[PDB]
Design a protein around this ligand. Structure first.
Ligand SMILES: COc1ccc(C2=NN(C(C)C)C(=O)[C@@H]3CC=CC[C@H]23)cc1C#CC(=O)NCCc1ccccc1F
Ligand SMILES: [Mg+2]
Ligand SMILES: [Zn+2]
Length: 332
């Protein structure tokens, strides 16, 4: 990994985000990428501003310069695909900020854990290719063989953590260089546990573990913190349906295209194509999003808000209103 240049930092530092509250739950990132001919430089600046305005980096001896080196090292390792690009992880970073500060989840974690979560947001899909874990295993691709031989089914998640550790071994981009001993260890262990928990094959088990811990006054405090961090990164990662309908609708179009491309390759590759990755099935977005709301996101957000995160009620309100707007699209 080559170092970040004065050219690159300036490219970001000069962006001034006019009429945009990055801390707000309605902050639009799609309209912020259409307000400049350098959407990447804008995104980095959102991430930068988010990270400084928390007041966390400074407390953990992470300079403004290191922090921006880190963000730009991250952005370099994301790809030009429809969904799992840099815009996605900046989205997850900004959304996690709102759950922590507008939803008051910060009250449940240490400053270090809040710092770790905002950082983990940016590393959590590094060098994603627009193909799910399943694709790599069904095609017996090298990464799939390595994961299967290695004994770990989370193909992509382990890849993401490998690159994250790369970026942070170089002090010029190590946002944790200011930590030592237990704190430094916790920052790495929790960043990795969180990324590994983003695998949706573990979705049910991560959710049931967090709810069992929240209902237990005698849960180990360390383990409750860890499961809260994991649930918050998971929350961020399926937060598309908690946003204003047009923002949510845009995210779904990008993710439907990414699914479709995989299913185009799975066909020429001659492997099993599921209904949702098949273009010629031309399934209605309305029904997709209603399906996703009903089976994954509504139950998830309802249960964590009831269990523990009462401050995040608005997510359940917006999911409810977004669903009703899709039902209206159907009814007409
Ligand atoms: C804005 O929307 C979405 C954001 C995220 C995802 C994900 N889904 N998943 C897994 C649940 C299959 C992943 O692993 C992805 C990778 C990591 C985290 C979450 C990601 C799906 C969507 C959607 C949608 C849509 O319109 N119809 C898709 C088909 C569908 C229909 C009914 C129920 C579920 C379902 F996926
Ligand atoms: Mg992922
Ligand atoms: Zn993600």
């Amino acid at each position: 990994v080559t170092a970040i240049t004065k050219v690159e930092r300036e490219a970001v530092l000069v962006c001034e985000l006019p009429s945009f509250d990055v801390t707000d739950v309605e902050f639009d990132l799609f309209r912020a990428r259409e307000s400049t001919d350098k959407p990447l430089d804008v995104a980095a600046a959102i991430a930068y501003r988010l990270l400084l305005g928390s007041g966390l980096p400074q407390k953990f001896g992470c300079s403004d310069e290191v922090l921006l080196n880190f963000i730009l090292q991250c952005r370099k390792k994301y790809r030009n695909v429809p969904y799992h690009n840099f815009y996605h992880v900046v989205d997850v970073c900004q959304t996690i900020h709102t759950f922590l500060y507008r939803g008051n989840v910060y009250e449940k974690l240490t400053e270090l854990e809040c710092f770790v979560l905002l950082i983990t947001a940016l590393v959590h899909d590094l060098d994603h290719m627009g193909l799910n874990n399943s694709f790599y295993l069904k095609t017996e691709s090298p990464l799939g063989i390595l994961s299967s031989a290695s004994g770990n089914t989370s193909v992509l998640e382990v890849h993401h953590c490998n690159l994250a550790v790369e970026i942070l071994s170089d002090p010029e981009s190590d946002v944790f260089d200011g930590l030592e001993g237990a704190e430094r260890t916790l920052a790495f262990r929790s960043m990795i546990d969180c990324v590994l928990a983003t695998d949706m094959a573990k979705h049910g088990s991560a959710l049931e573990a967090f709810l069992a811990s929240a209902a237990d006054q005698s849960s180990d405090e360390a383990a409750f913190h860890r499961m809260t961090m994991e649930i918050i990164l998971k929350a961020g990662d399926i937060s598309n349906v908690t946003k204003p309908f047009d923002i949510s609708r845009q995210w779904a179009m990008a993710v439907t295209e990414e699914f479709y491309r995989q299913g185009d390759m799975e066909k020429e590759r001659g492997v099993e194509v599921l209904p949702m990755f098949d273009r010629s099935k031309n399934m209605e977005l309305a029904k997709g999003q209603i399906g996703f709301i009903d089976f994954v996101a509504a139950p998830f957000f309802q249960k964590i808000v009831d269990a523990c995160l009462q401050g995040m009620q608005w997510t359940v309100d917006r999911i409810k209103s977004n669903r009703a707007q899709w039902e209206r699209v159907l009814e007409t």
